[PDB]
Amino acid sequence: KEWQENKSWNAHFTEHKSQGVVVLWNENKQQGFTNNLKRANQAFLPASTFKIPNSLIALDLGVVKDEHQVFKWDGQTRDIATWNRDHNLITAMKYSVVPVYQEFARQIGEARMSKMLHAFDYGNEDISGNVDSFWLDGGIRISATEQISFLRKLYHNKLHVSERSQRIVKQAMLTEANGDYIIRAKTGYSTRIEPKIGWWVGWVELDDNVWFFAMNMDMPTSDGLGLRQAITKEVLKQEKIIP
Amino acid sequence: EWQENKSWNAHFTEHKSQGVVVLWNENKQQGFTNNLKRANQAFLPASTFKIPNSLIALDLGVVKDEHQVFKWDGQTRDIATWNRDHNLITAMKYSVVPVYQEFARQIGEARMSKMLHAFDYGNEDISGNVDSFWLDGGIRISATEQISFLRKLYHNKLHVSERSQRIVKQAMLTEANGDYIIRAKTGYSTRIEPKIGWWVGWVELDDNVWFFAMNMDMPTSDGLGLRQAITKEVLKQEKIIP
Numbered sequence A: 001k002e003w004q005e006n007k008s009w010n011a012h013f014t015e016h017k018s019q020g021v022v023v024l025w026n027e028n029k030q031q032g033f034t035n036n037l038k039r040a041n042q043a044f045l046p047a048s049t050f051k052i053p054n055s056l057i058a059l060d061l062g063v064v065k066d067e068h069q070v071f072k073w074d075g076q077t078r079d080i081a082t083w084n085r086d087h088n089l090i091t092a093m094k095y096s097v098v099p100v101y102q103e104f105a106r107q108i109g110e111a112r113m114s115k116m117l118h119a120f121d122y123g124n125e126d127i128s129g130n131v132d133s134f135w136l137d138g139g140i141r142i143s144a145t146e147q148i149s150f151l152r153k154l155y156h157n158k159l160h161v162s163e164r165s166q167r168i169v170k171q172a173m174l175t176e177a178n179g180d181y182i183i184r185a186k187t188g189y190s191t192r193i194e195p196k197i198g199w200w201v202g203w204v205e206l207d208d209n210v211w212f213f214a215m216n217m218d219m220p221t222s223d224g225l226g227l228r229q230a231i232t233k234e235v236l237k238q239e240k241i242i243p
Numbered sequence B: 001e002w003q004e005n006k007s008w009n010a011h012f013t014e015h016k017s018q019g020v021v022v023l024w025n026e027n028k029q030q031g032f033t034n035n036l037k038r039a040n041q042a043f044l045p046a047s048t049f050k051i052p053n054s055l056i057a058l059d060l061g062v063v064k065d066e067h068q069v070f071k072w073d074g075q076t077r078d079i080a081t082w083n084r085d086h087n088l089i090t091a092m093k094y095s096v097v098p099v100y101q102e103f104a105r106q107i108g109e110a111r112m113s114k115m116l117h118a119f120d121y122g123n124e125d126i127s128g129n130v131d132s133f134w135l136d137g138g139i140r141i142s143a144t145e146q147i148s149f150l151r152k153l154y155h156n157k158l159h160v161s162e163r164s165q166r167i168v169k170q171a172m173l174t175e176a177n178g179d180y181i182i183r184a185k186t187g188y189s190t191r192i193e194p195k196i197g198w199w200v201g202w203v204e205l206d207d208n209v210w211f212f213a214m215n216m217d218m219p220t221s222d223g224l225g226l227r228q229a230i231t232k233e234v235l236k237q238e239k240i241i242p
Ligand SMILES: C[C@@H](O)[C@@H](C=O)[C@@H]1NC(C(=O)O)=C(S[C@@H]2CN[C@@H](C(=O)Nc3cccc(C(=O)O)c3)C2)[C@@H]1C
Pocket: B046, B047, B048, B079, B094, B095, B097, B135, B186, B187, B188, B189, B222, B223, B224, B225, B226
């Protein structure tokens, strides 16, 4: 029923001297939960979490033929050392390799990008800036609860792209697996336009249920980046979702 | 070509056991093993047959997809995890035999045999009962024949739909972290001597995949964790995982 606040989760933010929101959705029970109902609906730039729809679109249109296709380094040295090599969809996702996804966006084109985001009902559906950086510094915006809504369609293969493309993106989202749970998720870090924030959105697969999640948090500097996952799983342990 | 590495035997004798580990570097097209004869010895697949059984069930529509629930038939059985409802993901993770015995009966002897010929799976022999031939019938498969089958699956080149193979590989997911992904399936063959345990699958890296297939003697069920334990120590020794 509706969305419950639960500001006790704030203690793991203040624990690590931080402020942000965490939003969970129980798929069996169709109930929501968050430490901050109003930050849950604040729309921000998606930054690198835009790689989920951008991969879906690129795959649906044939810009990416499969998760094995190699995407050649263009030769510019960039600060994140892992970007300066060849990549496929899996590794490009894993290392949030932006130049590979900018090339996808150029090849997709503004018209086909905008059409597809409307068909996804993705955030505010506005791609106002340049075609290869609007999700980093242009007009698009999405809330935490709007991330969940999108992810739920992807889990059920209900987005208007091919089932095969959704399966592949779901394979590429794989982050962690063990006897107790599977995590498919994607990080982000919006630096170009204030407020500097870091994202983590995905879902937990259990034997018998699925818990979707989406968090964001103030990220003045790059050294607090690990608290995106770390805090989220502290919430997850508290609600006994993961051991 | 195939290289023998007897130093791996330390991790078997560490644990009062004997068996074979087989590794295949996909980038370099070279395999390795601690025992070349055992590597090519054919045993019953036991529950590693759930990989092809799943593929045929999905390709023929016996299973719609990975979320379709399979009803507990009521009967209580030794392994507690079996006595509940399952989908494909959990039926594999817990090796729920009754669910797969049901798949096989609906697949039928004819289609099951045609598929195993098209998979070139082991000795391609399904003599015995429709619902148990992989436990106590005629089918046999070696560690190196498991590798060959799994490489086709990795590349989607088995004579079934791409969708089927993708789904089965999702269901094979076992472990994942920042360093590696293991997709794999266990087995434990007791109905016919020699009693043995299986672990077959592969390790995905950023830039390579290592296929593995191991089996070991398994006199009691208390050694079953050695399947993963011993494999992982070979992988550590070969610097495939940290
Ligand atoms: C024909 C079937 O009856 C037989 C087919 O090969 C079943 N398949 C399996 C199997 O595992 O393949 C089992 S054993 C049971 C389920 N899996 C074991 C396990 O995960 N054990 C486990 C898992 C993790 C750690 C440890 C340990 O000993 O430390 C042990 C416990 C069944 C008898």
